[PDB]
Design a protein around this ligand. Structure first.
Ligand code: GDP
Ligand code: MG
Ligand code: MG
Ligand code: MG
Ligand code: MG
Length: 156
């Protein structure tokens, strides 16, 4: 079956692990050791297609085929840091055309300090999709990962 190597990047505490575990294990982690970096695998169906996802949950690469660049909507600094991660990815892949998706996580929270204009304008600056997620409620989580897969499909 088709295989896709995904990588989740972003500042500490944004929800990289929570997003990954919601996808892989279907549950929300209220805490997850910020030092655990691992790959997590799952056979899934995306748009009817059976495939294998291999997801690298990073902690603060070269074989990654698509990247989620994650910030938290209640963490301005995490948004500022997105550019460092995007550039890291461009360098590690030696390419400007790497599939990626901008993810604004923790959208369940009312304490928003990165607005929807900021996020949408950044995504337009990168020419990539922006997806609002909550690892807590599961809103957007499949959409974020699967959109990335569809970006890899396009790229292939
Ligand atoms: N309210 C809320 N909290 C979240 C969400 N995603 C992650 N968290 C919490 O934010 C903290 C850091 O998440 P974690 O996945 O460890 O972030 P990482 O350092 O990027 O892996 C944890 O306490 C999570 O339970 C979310 O969508 N909403
Ligand atoms: Mg983590
Ligand atoms: Mg491992
Ligand atoms: Mg099918
Ligand atoms: Mg502001």
């Amino acid at each position: 079956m088709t295989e896709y190597k995904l990588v989740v990047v972003g500042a500490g505490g944004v929800g990289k692990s929570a997003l990954t575990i919601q996808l892989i294990q279907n549950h929300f982690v209220d805490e997850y050791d910020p030092t655990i970096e691992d790959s997590y695998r799952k056979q899934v169906v995306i748009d009817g297609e059976t495939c294998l996802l291999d997801i690298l949950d990073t902690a603060g690469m070269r074989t990654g085929e698509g990247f989620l660049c994650v910030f938290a909507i209640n963490n301005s600094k995490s948004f500022a840091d997105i550019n460092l991660y995007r550039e890291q990815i461009k360098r590690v892949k030696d390419s400007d055309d790497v599939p990626m998706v901008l993810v604004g996580n923790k959208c369940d929270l009312p304490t928003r300090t990165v607005d929807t204009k900021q996020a949408h304008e950044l995504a337009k600056s990168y020419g990539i999709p922006f997806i609002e997620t909550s690892a807590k409620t599961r809103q957007g989580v499949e959409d974020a990962f699967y959109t990335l897969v569809r970006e890899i499909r396009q790229y292939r």
